[PDB]
Amino acid sequence: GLDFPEYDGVDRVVNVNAKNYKNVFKKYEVLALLYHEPPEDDKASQRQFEMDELILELAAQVLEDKGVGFGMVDSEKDAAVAKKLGLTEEDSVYVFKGDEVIEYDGEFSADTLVEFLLDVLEDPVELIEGERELQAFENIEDDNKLIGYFKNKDSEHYKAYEDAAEEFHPYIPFFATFDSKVAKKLTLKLNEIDFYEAFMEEPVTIPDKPNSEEEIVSFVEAHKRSTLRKLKPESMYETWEDDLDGIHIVAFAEETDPDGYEFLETLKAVAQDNTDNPDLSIIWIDPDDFPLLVPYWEKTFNIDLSAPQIGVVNVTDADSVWMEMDDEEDLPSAEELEDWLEDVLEG
Amino acid sequence: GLDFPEYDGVDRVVNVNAKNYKNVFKKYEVLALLYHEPPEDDKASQRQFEMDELILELAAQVLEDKGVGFGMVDSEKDAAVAKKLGLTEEDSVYVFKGDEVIEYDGEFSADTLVEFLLDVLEDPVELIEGERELQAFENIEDDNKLIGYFKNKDSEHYKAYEDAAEEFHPYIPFFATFDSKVAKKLTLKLNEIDFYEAFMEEPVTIPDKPNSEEEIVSFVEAHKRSTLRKLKPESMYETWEDDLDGIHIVAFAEETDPDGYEFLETLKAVAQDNTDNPDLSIIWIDPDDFPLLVPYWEKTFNIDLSAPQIGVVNVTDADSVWMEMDDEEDLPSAEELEDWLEDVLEG
Ligand SMILES: [Ca+2]
Ligand SMILES: [Ca+2]
Ligand SMILES: [Ca+2]
Ligand SMILES: [Ca+2]
Ligand SMILES: [Ca+2]
Ligand SMILES: [Ca+2]
Ligand SMILES: [Ca+2]
Ligand SMILES: [Ca+2]
Ligand SMILES: [Ca+2]
Ligand SMILES: [Ca+2]
Numbered sequence: 104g105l106d107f108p109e110y111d112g113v114d115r116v117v118n119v120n121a122k123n124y125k126n127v128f129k130k131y132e133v134l135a136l137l138y139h140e141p142p143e144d145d146k147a148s149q150r151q152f153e154m155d156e157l158i159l160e161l162a163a164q165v166l167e168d169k170g171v172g173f174g175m176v177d178s179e180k181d182a183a184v185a186k187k188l189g190l191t192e193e194d195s196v197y198v199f200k201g202d203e204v205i206e207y208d209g210e211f212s213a214d215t216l217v218e219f220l221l222d223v224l225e226d227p228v229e230l231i232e233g234e235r236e237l238q239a240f241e242n243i244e245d246d247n248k249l250i251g252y253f254k255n256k257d258s259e260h261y262k263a264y265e266d267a268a269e270e271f272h273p274y275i276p277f278f279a280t281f282d283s284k285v286a287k288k289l290t291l292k293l294n295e296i297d298f299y300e301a302f303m304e305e306p307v308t309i310p311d312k313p314n315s316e317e318e319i320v321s322f323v324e325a326h327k328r329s330t331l332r333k334l335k336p337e338s339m340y341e342t343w344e345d346d347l348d349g350i351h352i353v354a355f356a357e358e359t360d361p362d363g364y365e366f367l368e369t370l371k372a373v374a375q376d377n378t379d380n381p382d383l384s385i386i387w388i389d390p391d392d393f394p395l396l397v398p399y400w401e402k403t404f405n406i407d408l409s410a411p412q413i414g415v416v417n418v419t420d421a422d423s424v425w426m427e428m429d430d431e432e433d434l435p436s437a438e439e440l441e442d443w444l445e446d447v448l449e450g
Numbered sequence: 451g452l453d454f455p456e457y458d459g460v461d462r463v464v465n466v467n468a469k470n471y472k473n474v475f476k477k478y479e480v481l482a483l484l485y486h487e488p489p490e491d492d493k494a495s496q497r498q499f500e501m502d503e504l505i506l507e508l509a510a511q512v513l514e515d516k517g518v519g520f521g522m523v524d525s526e527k528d529a530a531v532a533k534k535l536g537l538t539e540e541d542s543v544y545v546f547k548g549d550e551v552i553e554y555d556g557e558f559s560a561d562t563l564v565e566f567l568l569d570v571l572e573d574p575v576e577l578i579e580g581e582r583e584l585q586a587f588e589n590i591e592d593d594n595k596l597i598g599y600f601k602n603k604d605s606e607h608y609k610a611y612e613d614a615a616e617e618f619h620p621y622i623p624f625f626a627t628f629d630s631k632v633a634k635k636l637t638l639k640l641n642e643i644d645f646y647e648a649f650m651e652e653p654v655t656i657p658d659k660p661n662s663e664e665e666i667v668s669f670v671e672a673h674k675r676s677t678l679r680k681l682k683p684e685s686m687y688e689t690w691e692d693d694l695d696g697i698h699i700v701a702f703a704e705e706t707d708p709d710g711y712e713f714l715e716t717l718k719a720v721a722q723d724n725t726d727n728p729d730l731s732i733i734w735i736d737p738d739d740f741p742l743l744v745p746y747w748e749k750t751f752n753i754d755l756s757a758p759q760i761g762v763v764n765v766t767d768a769d770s771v772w773m774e775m776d777d778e779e780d781l782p783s784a785e786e787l788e789d790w791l792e793d794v795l796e797g
Binding site for chain 1: 451452453454455456457458459460461493494495496497498500501504507508512513515516560561564565568582585586589686687690691693696708709741742743745746749765766767768777
């Protein structure tokens with residue numbers, strides 16, 4: 104009987120150098136490049152470099168038929184290539200698509216890279232025509248999202264919207280409709296764009312329509328840090344490095360768990376009630392999304408991640424404090440959570 | 451700022467050989483051994499061997515503080531060790547815990563191995579004392595599960611139950627209660643054991659209580675192939691190799707998708723209506739559980755896995771046939787699915 108696919112060991116990751124880098128770009132619709140330092144001589148450093156290269160090789164096999172290419176650039180041997188491509192972040196992945204470059208800041212794993220690059224392949228704007236499509240849009244909550252109403256694909260204002268969408272692709276989905284019925288239900292005027300903050304129910308309309316590309320981009324940059332934001336593998340390092348005053352409020356909640364779900368609903372209520380507070384950005388971590396970090400978290404924070412948790416983490420030393428909750432009692436209310444956070448953050 | 455944990459490149463996987471294998475077993479509560487053939491000389495074969503060893507090294511780092519050890523046994527250099535440990539399946543993982551051995555038959559990835567070994571560490575029987583625990587039990591559906599009512603931990607019949615639980619651990623959860631209130635709600639008499647087939651609402655009681663270990667084990671072996679079974683990474687190879695007459699009925703459905711959820715409910719209804727048919731065992735695949743195989747599946751089967759699918763697959767050549775469904779129409783009913791399956795399987 105034929106067996107499942109397996110890693111075949113055939114090398115597909117290109118050693119990108121001065122002589123071939125121009126041809127590599129022409130070959131691939133989407134190109135992922137690991138800009139890396141030369142591996143040190145010690146055995147441990149060699150293993151680390153070995154691990155990353157094989158993760159890329161596995162991703163390259165999976166996406167070979169999709170036209171996604173993978174390459175490596177040595178900061179020393181290929182220093183000239185790095186300069187003309189803008190590769191500055193040491194030991195980091197850069198993703199190239201047409202005229203856009205993405206400095207990847209997420210989990211370095213085959214699963215997350217493949218899912219991410221598959222999303223990169225998609226067009227930057229999703230059209231809403233059917234009712235299923237509209238329902239799918241309305242059910243998104245863990246991403247910021249935008250929806251605009253335009254006359255048709257040839258509208259000057261749609262093209263500006265599409266150009267702005269490319270700047271945040273694929274992290275922030277941009278949706279569009281040309282159908283006056285859909286716009287009516289969304290309460291969109293022609294050329295109007297609504298921004299739906301993650302986990303918020305009410306949108307914010309971009310002012311001064313019709314909107315240029317620059318007006319859209321600047322608005323999204325100002326609103327992309329949501330009051331409640333989910334730690335996602337594709338962007339985990341960016342989220343964590345985006346601390347306010349050197350601390351994060353961190354909430355663990357397993358969405359599929361009855362207690363985790365209830366706690367998440369309370370977190371959303373807290374976020375909703377403080378949405379315009381710029382000094383607040385709670386990170387929600389679903390431990391099911393990070394199975395390899397659960398032991399580390401339980402040891403480091405001395406908590407049981409089979410139950411909801413909320414705490415404050417100092418990003419310098421990983422020192423933390425976590426709210427006590429009794430399993431035999433009902434979970435804390437939104438008022439109780441805000442009260443506890445005020446106590447901790449005062450001192 | 452302190453960064454997330456990373457693979458540190460330190461070797462933790464033990465080269466198990468005649469001289470040390472006895473000490474390795476004493477050191478670890480749970481021991482995972484890769485029984486492997488000597489790597490061939492070609493570059494591709496070396497990469498494949500390289501990949502697997504580093505997957506184990508990553509798992510070993512994550513579970514180092516949990517007391518889970520990892521080792522490798524060479525079928526030739528360590529042939530003597532393989533014999534006394536019962537290592538027969540070439541290039542396969544064996545998991546040792548106390549007096550029990552598990553021939554792993556699941557996905558060879560760090561994520562799946564770590565999750566699996568964490569489950570192995572847990573005790574084989576889960577006691578139901580609180581209401582949350584009872585609700586958690588009742589909400590399990592994608593696993594076969596057992597629940598028994600016993601006087602206390604010192605009951606001869608509880609110990610027989612616990613001994614049987616070890617044989618299927620951690621694939622089939624065994625639950626127990628000593629509380630007459632819980633037993634009352636479950637409709638369990640003392641020493642009675644109910645088996646809940648995956649996705650079925652009504653349990654089957656093991657006959658002839660009180661039950662010996664052998665009676666429980668034999669009953670579970672006879673009932674573990676459920677009418678609807680989910681492809682799980684931890685056991686995907688066992689499920690797929692357990693075909694009936696050289697074909698599988700395969701259903702793709704994304705549980706979090708509105709159409710996928712509805713289709714899954716229909717599959718459960720089909721299974722329920724044919725539960726006592728031993729010639730039927732539908733495999734449900736949630737494509738979100740296997741992101742690295744979605745491109746392969748879409749290419750091989752010529753289907754769009756963003757929509758539910760049902761088909762028949764020949765396990766010899768991967769030849770298949772898939773039911774046509776119009777997105778603009780309501781999904782097929784249970785009667786329509788059974789009708790289509792009858793048509794395909796007749797010819
Ligand atoms: Ca290079
Ligand atoms: Ca996205
Ligand atoms: Ca409006
Ligand atoms: Ca304007
Ligand atoms: Ca806000
Ligand atoms: Ca060995
Ligand atoms: Ca299990
Ligand atoms: Ca009963
Ligand atoms: Ca008996
Ligand atoms: Ca059945």
